[PDB]
Ligand binder design. Structure first.
Ligand code: B12
Length: 228
């Protein structure tokens, strides 16, 4: 009750710091329902889902990582935060209206060795809201699996989230065949994630667009893939 009044005060004030703190606590405790309810309440106060993703979920998860690294959190608490985040976004995603099917398919995944996939999930939701069909190969996906999927389904778009790249040599070797396949089937490549801050990683992953976040990604989709 006292916590509710504080939370509504924060929602009326659009106080992102307060909202992040409340969400952080629910996430690291693994309290899915508190996370679900908080995110829905925040949405119904007039905050779009993308804004919640960019200015609540992302900052919180970044901070969690920093605290884990210093040993203030254990690794499983990051996992808890992931579960709560997945649950909270899915809840909202299942209940909110989507643009009608636009006749397009997006192939999504993360590279081999990377198990980070929340960003990918956020992106895939955004695509579906925009009317895309999405096929996820999930995290830790070899480029030949991407290539197979392209050969079978001929997607218009390939999205890659990369947080860590463990094997620079392997990806350097594999990328040629993958890229040639993409181009043969007329797909575009969009990349995003922390790993692409490394100039060498970015150079390997030949792309049509590199996204900073969901907002500019959406701007790309709207320019390059107009709504029918
Ligand atoms: C949660 C977490 C985990 C979870 C992942 C669970 C899951 N996803 O199912 C678990 C516990 C498995 C994990 C494991 C590990 N992780 Co970890 N993890 C994190 C954390 C907190 C991720 C938070 C997150 O998902 N943020 C949400 C997203 C949305 O933010 P984002 O990535 O910035 O994405 C935004 C943009 O980049 C963009 N974007 C991103 N991708 C894409 C793609 C497209 C197509 C588009 C358009 C846009 C886009 O849009 C997003 C929204 O704005 C980070 C901390 C961090 N991020 O700084 C550490 C972090 C990534 N992990 C780290 C490490 C070290 C590990 C481990 C090695 C730890 C260990 N010893 O066990 C392992 C390695 C696992 C592996 N093989 O990859 C380090 C990486 C350091 C480095 N640079 O090399 C980090 C940075 C923590 C730290 N501060 O040290 N991790």
């Amino acid at each position: 009750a006292a916590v509710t009044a504080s939370l509504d005060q924060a929602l009326v004030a659009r106080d992102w710091a307060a909202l992040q703190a409340r969400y952080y606590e629910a996430a690291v405790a693994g309290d899915e329902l508190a996370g679900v309810a908080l995110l829905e309440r925040a949405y119904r106060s007039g905050i779009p889902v993308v804004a919640l993703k960019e200015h609540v979920l992302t900052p919180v998860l970044h901070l969690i990582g920093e605290r884990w690294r210093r040993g203030e959190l254990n690794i499983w608490e990051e996992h808890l935060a992931s579960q709560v985040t997945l649950a909270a976004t899915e809840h909202l995603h299942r209940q909110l209206p989507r643009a009608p099917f636009n006749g397009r398919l997006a192939l999504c995944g993360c590279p081999e060795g990377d198990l980070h996939e929340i960003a990918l999930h956020l992106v895939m939701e955004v695509l579906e809201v925009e009317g895309w069909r999405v096929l996820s190969l999930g995290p830790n996906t070899p480029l030949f699996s991407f290539a197979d999927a392209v050969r079978r389904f001929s997607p218009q778009l390939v999205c890659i989230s990369a947080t860590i790249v463990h094997d620079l040599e392997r990806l350097r070797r594999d990328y040629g065949d993958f890229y040639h396949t993409v181009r043969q089937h007329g797909a575009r490549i969009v990349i995003g994630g922390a790993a692409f801050a490394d100039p060498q990683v970015r150079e390997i992953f030949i792309h049509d667009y590199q996204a900073a976040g969901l907002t500019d990604f959406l701007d790309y989709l709207r320019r390059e893939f107009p709504t029918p």
